[PDB]
Every structure is written in structure tokens, then in C-alpha cells.
Paper text:
[name]-1 [name] (PR) is an excellent target for antiretroviral therapy due to its crucial role in the life cycle of the [name] virus ([name]). [name]-1 [name] is a homodimer, with both chains participating in forming the active site of the enzyme. It processes the polyproteins into the structural proteins and enzymes during virion maturation. Inhibitors of PR target the active site of PR to inhibit the activity of the enzyme, thus preventing cleavage of Gag and [name] polyproteins and resulting in production of non-infectious virus particles.
PR was complexed with a new potent inhibitor containing an epoxy moiety within a Phe-Phe pseudodipeptide fragment. Analysis of the crystal structure of PR/EPX complex at 1.45 Å shows that the active site of PR is fully occupied by EPX in a single conformation with a surprisingly intact epoxide ring. This result is in contradiction with the general behavior of epoxide-containing molecules that usually show high reactivity towards nucleophiles, leading to ring opening. Previous crystallographic studies on PR/EPX complex evidenced that the β-carboxylate group of the catalytic aspartate residue 25B is involved in hydrogen bonding with the hydroxyl group of the inhibitor, contributing to successfully stabilizing the inhibitor in the active site. Conversely, the carboxyl group of the other aspartic acid 25A is in very close contact with one of the carbons of the oxirane ring. The distance between the two atoms is only 3.10 Å and the carboxylate oxygen atom is well aligned with the epoxide ring forming an angle of 95° with the carbon–carbon bond of the ring. However, a water molecule was found at hydrogen-bond distance from the oxygen and could provide protons to assist the epoxide opening. This evidence suggested that the reaction did not occur at pH 6.0, as described by the reported crystal structure, because Asp25A was not available as a nucleophile in the catalytic site, since it was protonated. From the stereochemical point of view, both oxirane carbon atoms of the EPX inhibitor, selected by PR, have absolute R-configuration. In particular, EPX forms two hydrogen bonds with the carbonyl O atoms of 27A and 48A glycine residues, acting as acceptor, and a hydrogen bond with the NH of aspartate 29A, acting as donor.
Residue numbers in the entry:
A (entry chain A), B (entry chain B): 1 to 99
């Protein structure tokens, strides 16, 4: 699919057995999802952006489906204001920017 | 061009006649460039990101070249960690996400 940028590029994702909406973000190195009770081990992390840093929990090898495309990788969980799909998963679904 | 996402989508921009590097950022509504002297009138604005809000200078109708493509629109100038081209100017250069 092709997604224009007139509005925030939100798509449905599936993660942890739940459906959420998330932002496809080429400006994010990492994928950051709203607080959710994912199973298993995790490592503390801090990620930053405009505004400063927030504290998140890093989960590895998480299966996520993004707009119907399966992916598997690292997901950070914490108090983000929006669900963000970063480049670590955008590459896996073969996403590009074109102009 | 077509740009893949294995590395940060950094490109050259010209703004105020100066070359800078900036990140093509589909997760950003707005374009935010690091503190600089820029010709044009501005007003104080606040913008938010992953870790809180910063103060910026809002400049409307600024001519900018992004990866060789012209845009004329609002540029926010302030203490962003990385120069970011957001959707307001990505739309002007005709950028889409594709997968
Ligand atoms: C999400 C994180 C992992 C991402 N950061 C990064 O990818 C890299 O972060 C840094 C931080 C400091 C220095 C160098 C690099 C980011 O903020 N990405 C932003 C761009 C950016 C800002 C500052 C530094 C680097 C990138 C931008 O894409 C995301 O904010 C949008 C998403 C959004 C939409 C609405 C409300 C809030 C947040």
C-alpha cells in the first residue's frame, strides 16, 4: 500500500493478542508502544526525543503485525503519547519513503 | 528517489542559504530545525514530542530545499536534538510511504 502524509500515517497493528493503532514513523529508530502487559523478560531502557527522555521496558523478539505484514523484533513499552512503529520494524515490512 | 530505512533517512537541506542535514520524519506533524539565524519574521510557539514540550520560534512561509526539492512553509526553530522534516513539508515534496 501507499500511504500519503496529509494526515498522521496511522495503521492497525496486532501485538500481544491486541489490536491497536500506531504511527508509521521514519524518524524513530525504535518502536514504542503504549503501556501493555506483555509477557516475559525485559530490560529497562530510556529513549529520547523532543522534550527529553522517558523510561520504557525493552522486550525482544516480539511478534507484531503491522497493516497485515508480520514482523518480529524489539518493542519498547512505556508512557508514550502515541504508538510508534520505528525503523527497526519498518525495514522488516519493506517500507520506503518515495518522492 | 526511493529511500529505504536501514539507516536514518538523513538528507541535505538548504535553508536561509545554508546547507544542513535533516531527518525525513513521517512521525512529525511539523518541521523543527536547530537554533540558527534565519531571515523572516517569527512568533513564539510550543511543540511536543516523545519526552515533553519545548519552546520554538515559528517562521511561516520559509523557502527550503529538501534533497533538491523545493518547499515553502512553516519551519520551527529551537533546541531539537535532530533537524526534522515533518509532514507539513514532506507533503509539499510529494513524499509517500510505500510497502
Ligand atoms: C520515538 C523515539 C524512539 C524517537 N527518537 C529517536 O529515534 C532517536 O532519538 C534521539 C534523541 C536524542 C538525540 C538523538 C536521537 C523520536 O522521538 N523520534 C521523533 C524524531 C526525532 C526527534 C528528536 C531526535 C531524534 C528524532 C519523531 O519521529 C517522533 O516524535 C514523533 C512521534 C510522536 C508523535 C506524536 C507525539 C509524540 C511523538
Amino acid at each position: 500500500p501507499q500511504i500519503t502524509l496529509w494526515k498522521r500515517p496511522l495503521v492497525t497493528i496486532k501485538i500481544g493478542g491486541q489490536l491497536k493503532e500506531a504511527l508509521l514513523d521514519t524518524g524513530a529508530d525504535d518502536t514504542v508502544i503504549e503501556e501493555m502487559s506483555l509477557p516475559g523478560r525485559w530490560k529497562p531502557k530510556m529513549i529520547g526525543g523532543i522534550g527529553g527522555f522517558i523510561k520504557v521496558r525493552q522486550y525482544d523478539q516480539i511478534i507484531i503485525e503491522i497493516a497485515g505484514h508480520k514482523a518480529i523484533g524489539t518493542v519498547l513499552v512505556g508512557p508514550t503519547p502515541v504508538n510508534i512503529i520505528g525503523r527497526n520494524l519498518l525495514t522488516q515490512i519493506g517500507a520506503t519513503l518515495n518522492f
